């Protein structure tokens, strides 16, 4: 009954950066060759939305944020074989395209027909299919959730269980992948290992998650907000510390804490004194340093290069490291054998319309995951 | 005629700093529990030794430095169990003390026994068997193999194969292990990757061989030094490239050389832009870079953490990661089983008294290695 023609519904238009979104009638174009519409069903609300309305992060506007989602399949372009009407899917910030030099490296995972490096807010051939008050609105990371039906190139789609409550399993798209991919695939923390994790937000608490799986001895929560350390020991942090109730640095009481330094400690935070805070804490001749959140656009940190000469490693990632066409449906099944639990993630729920509370409430520090429902 | 007495050679003192090595009469004390004395037969001259005569290495004067060496035992203190007067032996300037939480770890090396965090000159009981003028002199990085005896401790010396040749392998005491090492232990070379090595010296000469052995497809070595590529194509550099010739930044170059960026990238000079540099230039999803080199004291770096974020590694050792008492009786059977070459490192051969001309040579830039015999 739609298929083949231009959808009007409601999105979350982002006409300027650090204002409201306004839920506006948009006009969605039918998918062209290679690209599919969804119909979304739940999106999360993560801080890389926020940092497109603070500036932080700079993509082109005016744009339909939102990354974290799960949808219906509702048609399916020229040559699309991956996926179906009727499919439960979730969208890929990181595409999978399957042939350039990283999708074939058996490790990375930053394919290079990405949005992220130079954000052009298309689809992948250059065009937009948002049009709202007679005009075109930008992409965000090929994505784009925060509308009640999206346009994403079959690249920057994973086809889930078809049984899978997608109201919960939105947080895969970013979230809980990121965090945990960085404890099991990127740190790839051993057992009996030593873990410090600076920020127990969202993400944070996901890298505990991760850490405990791979069966860590103790997981040390490092936050400046005491009140994210009930939530911290419940998914698995042994212990929790406020820099603020310290009168030396905190690299320093993690160090002694750790009778020399943690075997692996995760940045979760995006502040340029607690990646190298973060890297100084780990054990001089074989720590490993894993660096998740992100900075502020184009400024540089000062680190003593001694901190790596004797041993330490420092890394990064996106999105845990995870491929994503190849690793959401294993995730997704994962979680339907109840071999992880994400409600713990998931504080507030608002109906879609309701967007603007949702992000108000994010930058409260409430929060640890609003879903939207549409 | 010499056990358990006191012994007269000549050794190079270093009474201060920039001043030339003063070959003099000393008393080299008798072994103590757990220590080893050992008569010199061939010594080299690294880098190291000389940043100790400038100030790029504080340690205290008077010193008797050199660190590069292969000599025989002649006699052994109370409790040495691991070598006897007479085999063949090699000092490490990393001890292996086998207790500590390094040591136990399966990857670590940077053994906390050692003296390169805070150098203090002296045996593990805070003494020095060297008595020059009747005034005490400092031991360096517990070694000390400018003197035609000297005493180092059971965990700073390892025995190797009794046939092996002095003049040769006592590289493997440091220059090569240290390059070989950083590529096939800390980097680990894949097989059929493409390296790129910044500096041409001794050590990046050894960073080279491990990455042919490794299988490396292609190897870029990068120098301003053009003298440099002949040994660098000799043993196994498929292609040399001279910052100086290009209108471009260096990176930019290797970047666009790799096809994207290179599989693994070493900074082996010691300089603070080479090192964001060869980060710079390895691929931005799963690329390696290892620093190799020591930059000068203190001196912060400034760099781009959003080169991490994508995948990168980043990752510096000492030794090249080798286990010191384990791994270089290893490397040295290899030599003998002929899995690798010695001879292209080693240029100038100097009888050890005319030790000044050697590091006159040195800071010429005109050699790779100069090996003082005795
Ligand atoms: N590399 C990737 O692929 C991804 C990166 N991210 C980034 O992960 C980071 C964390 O994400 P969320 O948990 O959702 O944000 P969040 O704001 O909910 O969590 C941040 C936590 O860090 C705490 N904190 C703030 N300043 C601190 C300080 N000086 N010291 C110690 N703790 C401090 C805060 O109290 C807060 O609890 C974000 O920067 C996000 O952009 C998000 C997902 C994927
Ligand atoms: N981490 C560890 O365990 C050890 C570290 N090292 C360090 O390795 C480094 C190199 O050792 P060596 O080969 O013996 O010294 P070297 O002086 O023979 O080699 C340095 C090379 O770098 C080249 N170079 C200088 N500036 C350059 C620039 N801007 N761009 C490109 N090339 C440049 C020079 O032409 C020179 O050939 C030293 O800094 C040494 O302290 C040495 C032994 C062990
Ligand atoms: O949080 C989701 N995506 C992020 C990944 C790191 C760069 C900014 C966008
Ligand atoms: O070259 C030998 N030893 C080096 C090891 C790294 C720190 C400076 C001294
Ligand atoms: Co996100
Ligand atoms: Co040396
Ligand atoms: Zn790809
Ligand atoms: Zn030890």
Request: glycine share 10%; aromatic share 6%.
């Amino acid at each position: 009954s739609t298929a083949g023609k231009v959808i009007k519904c409601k999105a979350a238009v982002l006409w300027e950066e650090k204002k409201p979104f306004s839920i506006e009638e948009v006009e969605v174009a039918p998918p062209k060759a290679h690209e599919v519409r969804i119909k979304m069903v739940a999106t999360g609300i993560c801080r890389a939305d926020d940092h497109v309305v603070s500036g932080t992060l700079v993509t082109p506007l005016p744009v339909i944020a939102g990354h974290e989602a799960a949808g219906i399949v509702e048609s399916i372009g020229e040559g699309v074989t991956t996926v179906r009407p009727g499919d439960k899917v979730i969208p890929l910030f990181t595409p999978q395209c399957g042939k350039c030099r990283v999708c074939k490296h058996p490790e990375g995972n930053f394919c290079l027909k990405n949005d992220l490096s130079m954000p052009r807010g298309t689809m992948q051939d250059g065009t937009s299919r948002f049009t709202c008050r007679g005009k075109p609105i930008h992409h965000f990371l090929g994505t784009s959730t925060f509308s009640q039906y999206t346009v994403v190139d079959e690249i920057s789609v994973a086809k889930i269980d078809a049984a899978s409550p997608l109201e919960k399993v939105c947080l895969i798209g970013c979230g809980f992948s990121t965090g945990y991919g960085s404890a099991v695939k990127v740190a790839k923390v051993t057992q009996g290992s030593t873990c410090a994790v600076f920020g127990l937000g969202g993400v944070g608490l996901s890298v505990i998650m991760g850490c405990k799986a791979a069966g860590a001895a103790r997981i040390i929560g490092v936050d400046i907000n005491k009140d994210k350390f009930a939530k911290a020991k419940e998914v698995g942090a042994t212990e929790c510390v406020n820099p603020q109730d310290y009168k030396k640095p905190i690299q320093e009481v993690l160090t002694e804490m750790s009778n020399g330094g943690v075997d692996f400690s995760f940045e979760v935070i995006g502040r340029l004194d607690t990646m190298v805070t973060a890297l100084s804490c780990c054990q001089e001749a074989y720590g490993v340093s894993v660096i998740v959140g992100v900075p502020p656009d184009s400024q540089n940190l000062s680190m003593n290069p001694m901190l790596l000469l004797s041993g330490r490693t420092w890394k990064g990632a996106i999105f845990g490291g995870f491929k994503s066409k190849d690793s959401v449906p294993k995730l997704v099944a994962d979680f339907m054998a109840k071999k992880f639990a994400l409600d713990p993630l998931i504080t507030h729920v608002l109906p879609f319309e309701k967007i603007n509370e949702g992000f108000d409430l994010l930058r409260s520090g409430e929060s640890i995951r609003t879903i939207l429902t549409f």
